[PDB]
Amino acid sequence: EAGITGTWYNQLGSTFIVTAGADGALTGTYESAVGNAESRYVLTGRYDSAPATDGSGTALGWTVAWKNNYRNAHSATTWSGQYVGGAEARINTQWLXTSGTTEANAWKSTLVGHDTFTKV
Amino acid sequence: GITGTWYNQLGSTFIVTAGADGALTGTYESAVGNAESRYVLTGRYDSAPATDGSGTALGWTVAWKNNYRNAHSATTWSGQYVGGAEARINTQWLXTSGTTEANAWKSTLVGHDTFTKVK
Amino acid sequence: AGITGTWYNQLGSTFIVTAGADGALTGTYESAVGNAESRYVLTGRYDSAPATDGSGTALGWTVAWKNNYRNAHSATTWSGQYVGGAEARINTQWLXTSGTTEANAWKSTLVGHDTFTKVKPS
Amino acid sequence: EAGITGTWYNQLGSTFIVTAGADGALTGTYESAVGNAESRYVLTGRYDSAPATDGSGTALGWTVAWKNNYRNAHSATTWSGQYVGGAEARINTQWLXTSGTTEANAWKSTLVGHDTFTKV
């Protein structure tokens, strides 16, 4: 997809390099400006390869597990959201970060936030 | 010990392979909502989890489009796998529907699914 | 019957609530976990005229995690529904926000789900 | 503390009128510019009345049940957040809306988002 494929950046300065395949796949890398993270991490996702043409955005999602060759955070984040094309295009997301925990700590495994991505 | 067939409390069926270098790939069949048959899923998991008996962090996405139906929709599950005795994948989820900018504020459902090895 | 009661969640926390007749929820919350001890004030609101087709009764409430013993600089809100019947239940999802710097604001917020029954644990 | 009490507005045009009591109570009204809402609704909540002084925000939250004299949506929204001071005062929140549903529809009961409130 000739909208989503690209390098994006969020309000935190993280970098989201992604390819939208014509089968609906998202593949690429993510580098977080914050948290227990360094360099690039593999990502994978899906998006709607045949969106409605009524002004609606294009639904998508992706996952990072925060292990690469330099560092393991024992944690993973999913972003669920939509691509808004056109003028200044955006990916608006909400995200769930889950840490590996004990059964006793499982109640505090999950952070929630919103990230917004632009090409600038 | 993730690879296999898992079921959530709604009767949905999550068929998944955990590749050696952290990939999750497979299919999801939802028992509810605007869905029929299988959907592709991909995701990631921590292939080197802490061995202090913490669960294994993971997540996956399904875009709700296959050859039968397109809900203009995508869900991510974020969670952890706990093995052993009565093994479980405990998740929370975010479904975003495609909406106009005017209805963006209501784009997103939230919930929780517990997946288990027994139906 | 109803919401007014002493409720307990899967964690063993204790939710003592009164449902006032024009929508108010008042009571105390004691958490078994986290940076907290003893009871905390809560307030909240509920649908005082639910549907009558089986639909649950929508509600929510807030606890700010400051009492006389401790201050966590935190607040949780539970959003959910009361289901009546065989064993009354309050299913919830909750959002805990800590006071953070502007720089740490991205990580201010935990999310979970708490299910409450009237059954005491031991 | 001082700064919460007042009239606030979020990015959707909604109006949040709130009084912070010195004991940690929040009371007031909430007019939503969207959804199945009309006119004012009662809110209550709580805030950390003795917040840290390292410019950290003040934790807070409130509830609105969407029933007033005009209308009943069979639903309730909680906002959880923090107040942040200075020349650009704001209340940054994430919110959960729960609709009353049948037991079969429990899984789809809850909507999530984020509101940013600004001091006029």
Ligand SMILES: O=C(O)CCCC[C@@H]1SC[C@@H]2NC(=O)N[C@@H]21
């Ligand atoms: O610290 C960890 O557990 C791993 C790094 C997490 C960074 C988070 S994920 C959501 C948010 N968006 C970002 O780009 N960074 C943070």
Ligand SMILES: O=C(O)CCCC[C@@H]1SC[C@@H]2NC(=O)N[C@@H]21
């Ligand atoms: O209706 C749609 O938009 C597509 C199907 C959504 C079904 C939801 S996603 C979360 C939840 N868990 C399931 O197993 N199914 C539902």
Ligand SMILES: O=C(O)CCCC[C@@H]1SC[C@@H]2NC(=O)N[C@@H]21
């Ligand atoms: O640690 C804090 O900041 C205050 C205590 C938080 C306890 C959380 S709120 C959600 C979950 N459910 C409970 O009953 N307790 C924990």
Ligand SMILES: O=C(O)CCCC[C@@H]1SC[C@@H]2NC(=O)N[C@@H]21
């Ligand atoms: O439609 C309903 O069920 C009642 C109105 C809900 C309004 C929502 S709640 C969060 C969001 N922020 C607002 O100010 N309004 C919407």
